[PDB]
Design a protein around this ligand. Structure first.
Ligand SMILES: CC(=O)N[C@H]1[C@H](O[C@@H]2[C@@H](O)[C@H](O)O[C@H](CO)[C@@H]2O)O[C@H](CO)[C@H](O)[C@@H]1O
Ligand SMILES: [Ca+2]
Ligand code: NA
Length: 139
């Protein structure tokens, strides 16, 4: 079951200002599929870039989901790392891999681990950007 996004805070290395349905980091956890976090594209900041979710406490987590934007593909993430921290400072890599560029939900499962923060690192994305409609973390 998903940890409540409402208790979370989102920050990112790069984010596009609020021009509607993009591109602030907080849009990745607002519960709306029509709103997205998107990395700066004026002018563009190159990958890699990341987004960090402060969980709102220490939880033991085993799953992560990435929902891409709908109706367009720019920034759909195709190569990632997932890192965790228990102190907000030190991060450790727990997952890495590839995703297809489609709009489909991407799911990561991993051995249960304690975390106060989860960081999604975007190494590759459509168009040289990174974006996300919704991010969720599961215990
Ligand atoms: C609606 C949309 O997809 N906006 C993204 C935007 O995508 C393209 C532009 O790249 C192009 O110049 O014009 C298109 C018109 O159909 C469309 O707006 O590109 C942005 C990054 O440059 C960002 O990804 C927008 O989310
Ligand atoms: Ca959203
Ligand atoms: Na934090």
């Amino acid at each position: 079951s998903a940890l409540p996004q409402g208790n979370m805070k989102a920050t990112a290395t790069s984010e596009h200002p609020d021009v509607g349905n993009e591109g602030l980091a907080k849009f990745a956890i607002d519960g709306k599929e029509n709103t997205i976090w998107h990395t700066k594209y004026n002018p563009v900041e190159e990958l890699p870039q990341s987004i960090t979710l402060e969980l709102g406490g220490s939880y033991e987590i085993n799953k992560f989901t990435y929902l891409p934007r709908s109706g367009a593909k720019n920034g759909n993430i195709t190569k990632y790392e997932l890192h965790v921290s228990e102190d907000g400072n030190n991060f450790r890599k727990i997952s890495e891999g590839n995703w297809d560029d489609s709009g489909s939900l991407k799911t990561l499962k991993f051995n249960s681990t304690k975390a106060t923060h989860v960081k999604l690192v975007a190494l590759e994305g459509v168009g040289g950007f990174a974006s996300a409609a919704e991010l969720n973390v599961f215990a």
